[PDB]
Amino acid sequence: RVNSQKPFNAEPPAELLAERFLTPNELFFTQNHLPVPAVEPSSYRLRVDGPGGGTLSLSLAELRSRFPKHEVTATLQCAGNRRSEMSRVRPVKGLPWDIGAISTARWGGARLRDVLLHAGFPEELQGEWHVCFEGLDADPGGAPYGASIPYGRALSPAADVLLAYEMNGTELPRDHGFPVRVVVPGVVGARSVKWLRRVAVSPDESPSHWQQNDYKGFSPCVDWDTVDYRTAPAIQELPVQSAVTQPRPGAAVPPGELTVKGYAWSGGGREVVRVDVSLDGGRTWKVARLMGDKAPPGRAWAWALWELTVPVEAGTELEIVCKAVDSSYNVQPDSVAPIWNLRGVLSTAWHRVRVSVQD
Amino acid sequence: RVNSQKPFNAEPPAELLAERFLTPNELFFTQNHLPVPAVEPSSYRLRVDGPGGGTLSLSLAELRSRFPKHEVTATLQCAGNRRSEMSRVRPVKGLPWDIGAISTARWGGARLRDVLLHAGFPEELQGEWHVCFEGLDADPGGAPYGASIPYGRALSPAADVLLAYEMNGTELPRDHGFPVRVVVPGVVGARSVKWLRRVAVSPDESPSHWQQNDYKGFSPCVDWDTVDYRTAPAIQELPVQSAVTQPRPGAAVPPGELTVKGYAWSGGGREVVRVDVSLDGGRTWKVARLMGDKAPPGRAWAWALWELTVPVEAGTELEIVCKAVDSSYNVQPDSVAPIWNLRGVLSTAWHRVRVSVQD
Numbered sequence: 001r002v003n004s005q006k007p008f009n010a011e012p013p014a015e016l017l018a019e020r021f022l023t024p025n026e027l028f029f030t031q032n033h034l035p036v037p038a039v040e041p042s043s044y045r046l047r048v049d050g051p052g053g054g055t056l057s058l059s060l061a062e063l064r065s066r067f068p069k070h071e072v073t074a075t076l077q078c079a080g081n082r083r084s085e086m087s088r089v090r091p092v093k094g095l096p097w098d099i100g101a102i103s104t105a106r107w108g109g110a111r112l113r114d115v116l117l118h119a120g121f122p123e124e125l126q127g128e129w130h131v132c133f134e135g136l137d138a139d140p141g142g143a144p145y146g147a148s149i150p151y152g153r154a155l156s157p158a159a160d161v162l163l164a165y166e167m168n169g170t171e172l173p174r175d176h177g178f179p180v181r182v183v184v185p186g187v188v189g190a191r192s193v194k195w196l197r198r199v200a201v202s203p204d205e206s207p208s209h210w211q212q213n214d215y216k217g218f219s220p221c222v223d224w225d226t227v228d229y230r231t232a233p234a235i236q237e238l239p240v241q242s243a244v245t246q247p248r249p250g251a252a253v254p255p256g257e258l259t260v261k262g263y264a265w266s267g268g269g270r271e272v273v274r275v276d277v278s279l280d281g282g283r284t285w286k287v288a289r290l291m292g293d294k295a296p297p298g299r300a301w302a303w304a305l306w307e308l309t310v311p312v313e314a315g316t317e318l319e320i321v322c323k324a325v326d327s328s329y330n331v332q333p334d335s336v337a338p339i340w341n342l343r344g345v346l347s348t349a350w351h352r353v354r355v356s357v358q359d
Numbered sequence: 360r361v362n363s364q365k366p367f368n369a370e371p372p373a374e375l376l377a378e379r380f381l382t383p384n385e386l387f388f389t390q391n392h393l394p395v396p397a398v399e400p401s402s403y404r405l406r407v408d409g410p411g412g413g414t415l416s417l418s419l420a421e422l423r424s425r426f427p428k429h430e431v432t433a434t435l436q437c438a439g440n441r442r443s444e445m446s447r448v449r450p451v452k453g454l455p456w457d458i459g460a461i462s463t464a465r466w467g468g469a470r471l472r473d474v475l476l477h478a479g480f481p482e483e484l485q486g487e488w489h490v491c492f493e494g495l496d497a498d499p500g501g502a503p504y505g506a507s508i509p510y511g512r513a514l515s516p517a518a519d520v521l522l523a524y525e526m527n528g529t530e531l532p533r534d535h536g537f538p539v540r541v542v543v544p545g546v547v548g549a550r551s552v553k554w555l556r557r558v559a560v561s562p563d564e565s566p567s568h569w570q571q572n573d574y575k576g577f578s579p580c581v582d583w584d585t586v587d588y589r590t591a592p593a594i595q596e597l598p599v600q601s602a603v604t605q606p607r608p609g610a611a612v613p614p615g616e617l618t619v620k621g622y623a624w625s626g627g628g629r630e631v632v633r634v635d636v637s638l639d640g641g642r643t644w645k646v647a648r649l650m651g652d653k654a655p656p657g658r659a660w661a662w663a664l665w666e667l668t669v670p671v672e673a674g675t676e677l678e679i680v681c682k683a684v685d686s687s688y689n690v691q692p693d694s695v696a697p698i699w700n701l702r703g704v705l706s707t708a709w710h711r712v713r714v715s716v717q718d
């Protein structure tokens with residue numbers, strides 16, 4: 001489903017979303033704020049500003065040859081995933097994503113860490129420094145999309161941050177950042193800047209509109225007339241999340257057995273340890289089966305698909321609800337109203353799907 | 360308020376709990392599962408089993424002198440903090456803690472990292488290894504209290520894991536582990552082993568009763584006849600938590616102005632970025648003022664004391680509720696029933712206090 005044509009925006013339909021662990025490049029949700037650039041490969045150069053005042057300038061061929069390729073399977077979830085659930089409480093501003101503003105791929109590229117060390121930068125710095133990013137895309141005024149991540153993450157081996165030039169074993173597609181994009185695992189999609197042009201180490205966060213004046217969380221009392229983005233931190237790691245892809249709202253399933261399916265995922269490398277599923281509106285719960293493979297501790301970048309086969313009687317009504325729990329034992333809240341915010345981001349309240357069972 | 364005298368455990372009353380950022384030693388909550396050992400200081404020796412069978416035997420004096428002392432202000436929260444709230448929904452096995460199984464202190468000691476590096480261990484190990492601890496307290500059959508943490512946390516410089524021999528400037532009180540205990544910042548109280556006698560690296564977790572068969576989160580439908588501690592992970596990092604320490608339930612407060620106060624904290628060094636407070640039972644919220652200085656990122660080991668000074672009208676009834684949000688945007692769930700578990704641990708639903716304003 002496309003909810004914006006210019007600038008483009010697409011989310012896969014639930015029927016396909018959790019059918020595979022690796023979301024095909026053609027299915028992978030697309031979020032573009034600005035016109036997508038047609039980057040000429042030969043002339044493309046990634047600039048990385050040195051510590052003293054220098055500049056590395058790497059061609060695509062250089063980025064591939066001088067740094068050992070590292071592959072990481074990581075799920076990208078946009079901050080507005082499940083925004084429409086929030087819009088139903090009170091209107092919000094933003095694209096009405098449903099449950100598909102999330103996808104997973106095996107990413108291939110150079111470690112940001114290695115590129116930075118290559119440019120002369122050190123393993124750490126006293127104080128809060130940041131690594132900033134600019135895309136080649138730009139508004140008419142010329143301001144480009146940018147984001148940043150704390151330096152410590154940028155430099156950590158374990159955090160697996162990549163400057164990827166491959167996606168599911170093929171070069172990055174145009175809509176997903178060709179020829180290069182940052183992929184920040186366990187972090188909101190907004191920071192994985194596509195069509196990367198520059199990487200700069202700064203003592204301050206990125207001055208870009210989307211780092212500073214967007215993608216933050218506020219109290220549900222905050223409205224447009226009081227919002228102040230200085231009172232909140234930029235979304236980086238995301239909270240624990242889940243949703244039901246099967247069955248679909250209003251479905252009419254046959255009696256006997258029913259296989260409920262969905263996804264679950266948590267930020268900052270935390271694995272999903274359990275997914276509870278209910279069929280009576282959240283009053284009684286059963287444990288779903290997690291499909292997947294344990295990732296190393298603290299490096300659970302990819303979602304977990306789950307399923308549960310369960311008896312269903314003829315003529316009954318169901319309200320299927322799923323909630324997940326991660327390695328830190330963080331949980332999803334019951335309702336949307338108390339996590340409500342004027343931008344409809346950070347929508348993790350329990351997902352609910354009503355269906356009937358045929359006679 | 361003592362919940363059991365043999366073995367001992369005590370929690371501070373709420374009106375004292377959050378008066379000071381650092382909780383006074385004679386007030387810091389106490390949880391002992393076994394008789395408190397009496398330790399002669401000169402003859403005490405910490406045993407740390409080395410990589411190829413060597414044994415490092417450290418006296419208290421060597422531990423202080425050979426490794427640079429490091430201070431870390433960290434909050435310990437027991438897994439059963441707020442168990443009674445959960446009990447009341449449906450009975451659970453465990454000491455009936457109210458909101459006080461949590462306390463804060465400036466700890467001083469040798470970094471576990473430094474001790475293991477000295478003992479011959481490397482920075483990292485292939486696969487999952489664990490660092491195990493045994494205390495000097497034992498059951499009649501002689502099995503000691505024990506716990507463990509992943510090797511990666513033990514060797515991480517940012518994780519600030521200590522072999523603490525100081526607490527709020529004085530040496531450890533008996534009940535809190537004299538002469539040495541482990542302090543695992545950002546992690547459940549159970550792993551900070553008191554009266555430490557042994558440190559060992561092992562490919563497996565600690566076989567203690569309280570690492571294998573206690574302190575885990577289960578689905579609400581799990582009962583005693585179905586529970587299986589192999590299906591869940593040991594509690595390490597704790598979820599976001601908060602409570603109201605002032606006013607107290609049943610209070611009749613004077614009209615005009617009321618100052619509501621409490622604490623908020625999250626595991627894993629994740630700072631508390633906001634605390635929402637409601638006076639009308641969660642229907643509307645207001646942002647509290649966070650007292651205390653910010654810690655470095657990823658290193659918020661100490662709670663945030665909060666407060667909200669709000670105008671109140673005579674004759675009105677209030678239902679005070681608080682909820683906190685952490686650096687990962689994790690949140691607390693609305694209700695207790697769906698996070699219910701048979702041991703009454705991981706009680707983080709919103710805390711609610713009923714008071715009224717004098718007529």
Ligand SMILES: Nc1nc2c(c(=O)[nH]1)N[C@H]1C(S)=C(S)[C@@H](COP(=O)(O)O)O[C@H]1N2
Binds near residue numbers: 029192193
């Ligand atoms: N340069 C550039 N990078 C960007 C964006 C953008 O509009 N421009 N969108 C961001 C956000 S908000 C999202 S959710 C993800 C989505 O990437 P995808 O379209 O490849 O799924 O990319 C991020 N990278």
Ligand SMILES: Nc1nc2c(c(=O)[nH]1)N[C@H]1C(S)=C(S)[C@@H](COP(=O)(O)O)O[C@H]1N2
Binds near residue numbers: 504505535553
């Ligand atoms: N050796 C020893 N250490 C232990 C305990 C125990 O019974 N024995 N209890 C644990 C748990 S469950 C808690 S919550 C904390 C309590 O620490 P405190 O008594 O210093 O507050 O210590 C942990 N360390």
Ligand SMILES: [Mo]
Binds near residue numbers: 079080190
């Ligand atoms: Mo996004």
Ligand SMILES: [Mo]
Binds near residue numbers: 438439549
């Ligand atoms: Mo505990």
